[PDB]
């Protein structure tokens, strides 16, 4: 009947029950797209590349209408000042762009197969 | 046996057909060749308009 | 939320919940009806063009 | 340890000019950023080797030759 | 209840969780790394030689002792000269043990017009560099004679680069007043240059 | 630590200008003339 000193925090059983049911339901919702009352479960609203391309579009359009030469802002970072390779000079933006397909996801199969 | 003129014309016609179908594989979006070899007047990389949902700048 | 604590309502506790939803607006969160929710009136894929 | 090591390692301006002028043909503040760090590292490594040679290795070499395997 | 107290209590909880998880991962990494040594010691016991495994364990202790003697104190520990000569680096093997015929410069295969001197200049620039040769100092290749050889082969690309350089500056009629440019315009394009 | 006491997201370069190559510096073998008076090196304003 003795639980503990009550100065050490106790997590309730409802926290584990919610955790257990939520993990199982998340797995089931990922396996069956189209059956969540006709819908599916996404993990984001907008692609970061899509948002950055829209913001660059509006930024260079506003720069051009103000009478200046427009600038493109690069995800990851700008160039390094080196002289040995093109890939070392532009490494940060190249590193952002090389990660495109796993950033988009998902890492699980997109369609259901019955074994 | 050496080709006559109509055989040369026929194979040039078919090769141009093949070359069009071959150039359909030329800019894989976010492929390595496009990321490293598509550059502006200087050596700077450009943002190619190949993204599947955004058509910027009145395109 | 698991501790079911209950005061009345004070100004600092008013600012806590505003700050939580404000900061959650800046992150990436899950959605249940994403194709309906990203619809827009006009010829665009979103409301941000 | 970090500050105590950094007292040994970090060189002054004369070592950096000294390490630049023999490795490269040019005096400092005329270089790329990546080739300044090479001169700074060479000066710090010279300071480390000099400290180990004159302050740790001057009195630990009394030849107790034994304890082989 | 204040924001500062909540942020500090969150920071302390995150720090203690992350530090204990890192300690568990470091122990698990050591347990993954060292498995082959324990397996070989156990196999040495199980083959029918129980006394030789204790020699392996005390040899690990004596190796730690030898490391402390060699690195901190600096003693010689004789027999180290025979151990130092057993191994070598890649560039030292290139300097000392490889023939010169096992290196090429992509241009001795591309251009048949090359003489022996341009061939060895390309070899020293691109095949075996100054750190891969025995009597090699930096600055062996001139890079101005190399540019002259690279301009002798394919001269029209050099002419194009000279045009672009003259167009970037304001020396375009100084480009066209060179003694061969109007003649090569006449040769390539069958009409004289009107402009 | 020297760059962290500074603001490394504040003084670094994040942006580049984009300059279009002229036809002499572009992909010359891709430029073709179609029955005279036309060529496929396209150029149009956003307006
Ligand atoms: C970096 C990523 C790791 C960071 C983890 C969060 C940092 C923990 C902060 C804890 C802390 O002490 O905060 C301090 C606060 C207060 O925590 C306690 O609260 C008590 C009453 O509120 C008393 O005040 C105690 O003094 C105080 O320690 O803790 C929290 O509010 C967060 C607790 C997090 C507990 C997890 C609940 C969610 C359970 C999900 C199940 C996870 C299962 C694993 C899945 C993976």
Tell me the C-alpha distance between F4 and E188, whole Å.
61
User: Which residues are within 8 A (CB) of F39 and not within 5 positions of it... i.e. 6 or more apart?
Assistant: F31, F32, F33
User: Which residues are within 8 A (CB) of D23 and not within 5 positions of it... i.e. 6 or more apart?
Assistant: D38, D39, D42
Tell me the C-alpha distance between E150 and E144, whole Å.
10
CB atoms B36 and A86 under 8 Å: yes
Tell me the C-alpha distance between A77 and B1, whole Å.
62
Give a three-class secondary structure readout of D2-66.
HHHHHHHHCCCHHHHHHHHHHHCCCCCCCCCHHHHHHHHHHHHHHHHHHHHHHHHCCCCCCCCCC
Q: Which residues pair with C31 in a beta bridge?
A: A42
- Mark which residues 2-61 of D lie under 8 Å from E by CB: 56-57, 60-61
From residue E34, alpha-carbon distances to A110, E31, E41, E50 in Å are 40, 6, 11, 20
Task: Give the three-state DSSP class for E4.
Answer: helix
Q: Residue F39: what are its φ and ψ, rounded to 5°?
A: -145, 160
Place of tokens 């599916």: A40
Chains sharing 3 or more CB pairs under 8 A with chain A: B, C, D, F
Tell me the C-alpha distance between E152 and E169, whole Å.
24
Task: Give the three-state DSSP class for A72.
Answer: strand
Tell me the C-alpha distance between D11 and D43, whole Å.
6
Ligand 1 mean position, distance from CA E13 (Å): 7
Tell me the C-alpha distance between E123 and E105, whole Å.
6
Q: Residue E45: what are its φ and ψ, rounded to 5°?
A: -65, -45
Q: Are A106 and A27 in contact (CB under 8 A)?
A: no
Place of tokens 């490394």: F8
F11-47 in b/e form (b: 16+ CB < 10 A) is: eeeeebebeeeeeeeeeeeeeeeeeeeeeeeeeeeee
Pocket of ligand 1 (CB under 6 A): A 9, 15, 19; E 9-10, 13-14, 17
Task: Give the three-state DSSP class for A73.
Answer: strand
Tell me the C-alpha distance between E161 and E147, whole Å.
13
Q: Are B39 and A87 in contact (CB under 8 A)?
A: no
Q: Give the count of alpha carbons within 13 A of D16, CB side only.
A: 13
Q: Are A78 and F12 in contact (CB under 8 A)?
A: yes
DSSP E95-154: HHS--GGG---SSTTT-SS--HHHHHHHIIIIIS-TTSSTT--TT-S-SSHHHHHHHHSS
Which stretch of DSSP H or E encloses residue E46?
A: helix E35-46
Which of E175, E154, E153, E155 shows the shortest CA–CA distance to E164?
A: E175
Q: Residue A64: what are its φ and ψ, rounded to 5°?
A: -70, -40
Q: Are D26 and D17 in contact (CB under 8 A)?
A: no
Tell me the C-alpha distance between E25 and E121, whole Å.
54
Tell me the C-alpha distance between C16 and C1, whole Å.
13
Task: Give the three-state DSSP class for C31.
Answer: strand
From residue B1, alpha-carbon distances to B4, B7, E114 in Å are 9, 12, 38
Q: Residue B53: what are its φ and ψ, rounded to 5°?
A: -120, -10
Q: Method of determination?
A: cryo-EM
Structure tokens at E2: 């204040």
Ligand 1 mean position, distance from CA E24 (Å): 20
Q: Residue A36: what are its φ and ψ, rounded to 5°?
A: -90, 70
Tell me the C-alpha distance between A6 and A35, whole Å.
45
* Pocket perturbation via mutation, ligand 1, pick of E9, E11, E17, E25 by most ligand atoms within 8 A of CB: E9
- Other Cβ atoms within 10 Å of A23 Cβ, number: 10
Q: Are D15 and D46 in contact (CB under 8 A)?
A: yes
Torsion sign, CA atoms E35, E40, E42, E46: positive
Helix axes D33-51, D2-9, angle to 10 degrees: 100
Tell me the C-alpha distance between D27 and D16, whole Å.
9
Q: How many degrees, rounded to 5, is the angle at CA C8 between CA C3 and CA C13?
A: 75
- C49 part of contact set with chain B, CB < 8 Å: yes
Which of C47, C25, C46, C30 shows the shortest CA–CA distance to A39?
A: C30
Structure tokens at E44: 């040495």
Which of E110, E109, E103 shows the shortest CA–CA distance to E124?
A: E103
Q: Which residues pair with B45 in a beta bridge?
A: B39
Atom of ligand 1 nearest to the CA of E9: 14
**Shortest CA distance from C10: residue in chain E:** E1
Resolution to 1 decimal place, in Å = 2.5
DSSP F7-38: -TTTSS--EEE--PPPGGGS-GGG--BSSSS-
Which residue's CA lies nearest to atom 5 of ligand 1? E14
F and B touch with 3+ CB pairs <8 Å, answer yes
- A85 part of contact set with chain D, CB < 8 Å: no
């Amino acid at each position: 009947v003795y639980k503990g000193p009550a100065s050490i925090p106790h997590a309730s059983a409802e926290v584990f029950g919610a955790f257990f049911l939520a993990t199982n339901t998340a797995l089931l919702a990922h396996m069956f797209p189209g059956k969540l009352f006709g819908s599916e479960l996404h993990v984001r609203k907008w692609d970061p590349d899509y948002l950055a391309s829209c913001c660059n579009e509006q930024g260079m359009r506003r720069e051009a209408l103000s009478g200046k030469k427009p600038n493109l802002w690069l995800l990851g970072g700008g160039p390094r000042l080196v002289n040995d390779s093109w890939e070392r000079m532009w490494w940060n933006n190249l590193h952002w762009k090389r990660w495109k397909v796993p950033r988009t996801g998902p890492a699980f199969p997109q369609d259901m197969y019955w074994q | 046996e050496m080709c006559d003129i109509p055989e040369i014309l026929g194979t040039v016609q078919e090769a141009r057909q093949i070359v069009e179908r071959a150039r359909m594989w030329r800019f894989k979006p976010y492929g390595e060749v496009g990321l490293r070899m598509a550059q502006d007047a200087n050596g700077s990389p450009v943002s190619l308009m190949q993204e599947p949902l955004h058509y910027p700048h009145g395109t | 939320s698991s501790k079911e604590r209950r005061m009345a309502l004070e100004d600092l506790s008013k600012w806590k919940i505003f700050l939580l939803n404000f900061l959650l607006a800046l992150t990436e969160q899950s959605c249940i009806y994403p194709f309906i929710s990203n619809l827009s009136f006009g010829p665009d894929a979103s409301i941000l063009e | 340890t970090v500050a105590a090591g950094a007292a040994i390692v970090v060189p002054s301006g004369k070592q950096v000019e000294a390490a630049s002028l023999d490795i490269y043909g040019r005096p400092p503040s005329q270089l790329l950023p990546n080739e300044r760090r090479a001169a700074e590292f060479a000066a710090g490594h010279r300071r480390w080797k000099g400290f180990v040679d004159n302050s740790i290795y001057s009195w630990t070499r009394t030849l107790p030759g034994h304890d082989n395997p | 209840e204040p924001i500062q107290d909540e942020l500090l209590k969150l920071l302390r909880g995150g720090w203690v969780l992350l530090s204990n998880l890192a300690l568990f991962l470091v122990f698990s990494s050591f347990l993954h790394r060292s498995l082959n040594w324990f397996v070989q010691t156990e196999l040495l016991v199980a083959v029918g030689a129980p006394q030789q495994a204790g020699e392996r364990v005390v040899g690990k202790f004596f190796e730690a002792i030898e490391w402390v003697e060699r690195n901190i104190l600096g003693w010689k520990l004789p027999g180290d000269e025979e151990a130092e000569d057993a191994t070598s680096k890649v560039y030292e093997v290139l300097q000392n043990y490889t023939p010169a015929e096992a290196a090429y410069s992509f241009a001795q295969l591309k251009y048949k017009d090359l003489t022996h001197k341009e061939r060895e200049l390309f070899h020293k620039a691109y095949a075996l560099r100054h750190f891969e040769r025995r009597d090699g100092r930096p600055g062996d290749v001139d890079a101005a004679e190399l540019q002259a050889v690279k301009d002798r082969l394919d001269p029209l690309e050099a002419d194009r680069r000279a045009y672009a350089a003259a167009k970037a500056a304001g020396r375009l009629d100084e480009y066209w007043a060179a003694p061969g440019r109007e003649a090569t315009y006449q040769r390539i394009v069958g009409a004289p240059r009107i402009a | 630590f020297k760059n962290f006491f500074s603001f490394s997201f504040l003084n670094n370069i994040w942006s580049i200008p984009i300059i279009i190559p002229d036809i002499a510096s572009a992909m010359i073998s891709e430029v073709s003339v179609l029955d005279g008076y036309f060529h496929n090196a396209f150029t149009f304003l956003e307006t």
